[PDB]
Design a protein around this ligand. Structure first.
Ligand SMILES: Cc1cc2nc3c(=O)[nH]c(=O)nc-3n(C[C@H](O)[C@H](O)[C@H](O)COP(=O)(O)OP(=O)(O)OC[C@H]3O[C@@H](n4cnc5c(N)ncnc54)[C@H](O)[C@@H]3O)c2cc1C
Ligand SMILES: Cc1cc2nc3c(=O)[nH]c(=O)nc-3n(C[C@H](O)[C@H](O)[C@H](O)COP(=O)(O)OP(=O)(O)OC[C@H]3O[C@@H](n4cnc5c(N)ncnc54)[C@H](O)[C@@H]3O)c2cc1C
Ligand SMILES: [Ca+2]
Ligand SMILES: [Ca+2]
Ligand SMILES: [Ca+2]
Lengths: 356, 338
């Protein structure tokens, strides 16, 4: 893809103007804020008012212990970790605003944005650069009954919930047809008595030899051409799925105490859907190995631009790259501004061992 | 570059054989270790015996204050931070070996490698995949007297050492000829009474506007075509530099209480010189966005493949990516083994 360069002909907001605005409060956005705040760039971070359904702090506030974020040899809850992130962001002078960003206009620079409830045309605020760190959510199908048994038998992270006592030596279902499903199904055979994999199609997304290992497994039944149409239970836990074969028409109840969605994630791209290039799955496209979107001056970090790795530690590293690339652009344009005195020009100071 | 795919008929080692060996012990290698151990792949991580002049744990073992690694809002010392990384790697079952890997043979898989002092031909060990996380050294220029005043006036990290009292309101010098020199000199104007920039070339490799701003800063003097030839002091701390002009040959004395190198990020790639695709500066080339090197089965993480960001948090992230991609390759090759 190409990078559009917006004309720098837009008006400056008298309500609030910032050199860099961060949208989103997961590990991606807070790491960007830490770096920009320490660079004295006075970042503004919008953490959301239950934005996209998540409290400030992001997806990690919906899990418990985190054990693969380095620096915590005894583990740390997702809640504590994101309190730590937010405190570090704040400590160095991030302006953290508990508001959802409702709309952005990327047409001209400085970019215009509006917070939820302050959305009249004359209430815009401006940003010379924007870092999009809005995250993602796991895809669900919202089956009849799912509202009842979500997190009471129905899950969207098999490696997170697999060992939970409610699944142990119980029949389990996985919905999915990709490498995600065949991987999560194999893992669930450590705990369930049996794992059914419901595949909408008759064939495979995962490498044709790998799902051959699925079928060969005695604790695994792949139900091809099969979909789930309802989630039933007893008032406390999921106890069965209504399933249907779409080629043979066979339908009936499949008792399971567990249903694990492995159908992907939905990136939180609503703010920019028609304004930055997106990939086939809706993720923000970035110059590979970089935070740069298809719009000059707009950067993206975290899961909103990563469908492959999807970790806190990669989201954090990715937010640092966004901070460093936004600051470099800001430094470049301040250097080219002959009106600003040299002593007033921002220069990054982010390296330790230089590379000249 | 193309990704060469090695034959998988190589001799398996009887001394030790592993599914994945991680070379290096900074934030990159330990994050990869954590993920691979948790994936029950039993990673082997060589943390070095003072490899590259750094204790196990990497570059951070020479800073007392890490403030921008998220999760530590009150800061942490670099050695405490990397001790925590090491404890996490070992908690989930990493086999951590305090040895420098001295030699690697990437020609066939499983790859052969040798640790320092055990480099006889028959002493090889094998790894089905390797994660190169060897980081970077601190490259000190040739400078008589540098031995006496290194870390007593001379320093390779402006943003680390700039604020210590010995430099405060005193003349300071920066050696370098690009953006890093411009960045460090401007930062040091906050603390020095004045900052000279010693530029080896006739033109700052930095953009013309960056070079333009450097020269017109009221607390900065860019000395073009200038090299340091001697560091001088009272026998305890640095007090001046002898400098030479490369175009006129004139020699002078420059009073400075601090000298900061803005060069000397050397990626640690000697192990794989001529075996993986390297850029002009010795950095390992990776399929962008990935950890994949020019040889199938070899992944890279951290500063050894990142000339651009060079942070511990980005090194950790890229170590995770290396691990996920090595786990994936190991997975497809186990599944295909019928
Ligand atoms: C159940 C579960 C368990 C997990 N466990 C682990 C684990 O153990 N280890 C690990 O490494 N990873 C884990 N992850 C993944 C990890 O949480 C994500 O990779 C990471 O949090 C993504 O960070 P992010 O920066 O993309 O933002 P997110 O964490 O996705 O957070 C985005 C935030 O931005 C806010 N936001 C969105 N839109 C707006 C807007 N318009 N205005 C303002 N705010 C907005 C949202 O409200 C949200 O709070 C887990 C994920 C889940 C779902
Ligand atoms: C003085 C200083 C201060 C810094 N402060 C900060 C800071 O505050 N924040 C920040 O984000 N970054 C900071 N950095 C940068 C940060 O330390 C690096 O970006 C990061 O550590 C790179 O990690 P790495 O995984 O590439 O490995 P490195 O940190 O480079 O460590 C690699 C390790 O591998 C070992 N090794 C090398 N070769 C071999 C071999 N053949 N066999 C076995 N072991 C081997 C080495 O001994 C070393 O211990 C600082 C750097 C320096 C020099
Ligand atoms: Ca509001
Ligand atoms: Ca030895
Ligand atoms: Ca003379």
């Amino acid at each position: 893809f190409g990078v559009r360069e917006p004309k720098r002909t837009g008006e400056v907001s008298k309500k609030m103007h910032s050199k860099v605005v961060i949208i989103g409060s997961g590990p991606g956005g807070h790491t960007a804020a830490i770096y920009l705040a320490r660079a004295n760039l006075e970042p503004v971070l919008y953490e959301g008012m239950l934005a996209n359904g998540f409290a400030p702090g992001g997806q990690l506030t919906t899990t418990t212990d985190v054990e693969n974020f380095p620096g915590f040899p005894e583990g740390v809850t997702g809640t504590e970790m994101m309190d730590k992130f937010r405190a570090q962001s704040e400590r160095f002078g991030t302006k953290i605003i508990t508001e959802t960003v409702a709309r952005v206009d990327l047409s001209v620079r400085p970019f215009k944005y509006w917070t939820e409830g302050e959305e009249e045309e004359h209430e815009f605020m401006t940003a010379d650069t924007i870092i999009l760190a809005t995250g993602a959510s796991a895809k669900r199908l919202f089956l009849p009954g799912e509202e009842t048994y979500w997190q009471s038998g129905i899950s969207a992270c098999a490696v997170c919930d697999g060992a939970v006592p409610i699944f142990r030596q119980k029949p389990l279902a996985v919905i999915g047809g990709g490498d995600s499903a065949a991987e999560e199904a194999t893992y669930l055979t450590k705990y369930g008595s049996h794992v059914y994999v419901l595949v909408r199609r008759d064939e495979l997304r995962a490498s044709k030899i790998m799902a051959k290992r699925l079928t060969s497994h005695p604790k695994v039944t792949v139900l091809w051409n099969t979909v789930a149409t309802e989630a039933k239970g007893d008032g406390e836990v999921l106890t069965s799925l209504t399933i249907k074969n779409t080629k043979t028409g066979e339908t009936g109840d499949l008792p399971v105490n567990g249903l694990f969605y492995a159908i992907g994630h939905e990136p939180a791209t609503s703010l920019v859907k028609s304004q930055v290039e997106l990939d086939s799955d809706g993720y923000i496209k970035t110059v590979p190995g970089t935070s740069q979107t298809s719009v000059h001056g707009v950067f993206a970090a975290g899961d909103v631009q990563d469908k492959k790795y999807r970790q806190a530690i990669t989201s954090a590293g990715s937010g640092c790259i966004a901070a460093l690339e936004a600051e470099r652009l800001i430094s470049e344009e301040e250097a080219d501004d002959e009106s600003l005195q040299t002593e007033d020009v921002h220069v990054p100071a982010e390296h330790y061992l230089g590379t000249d």
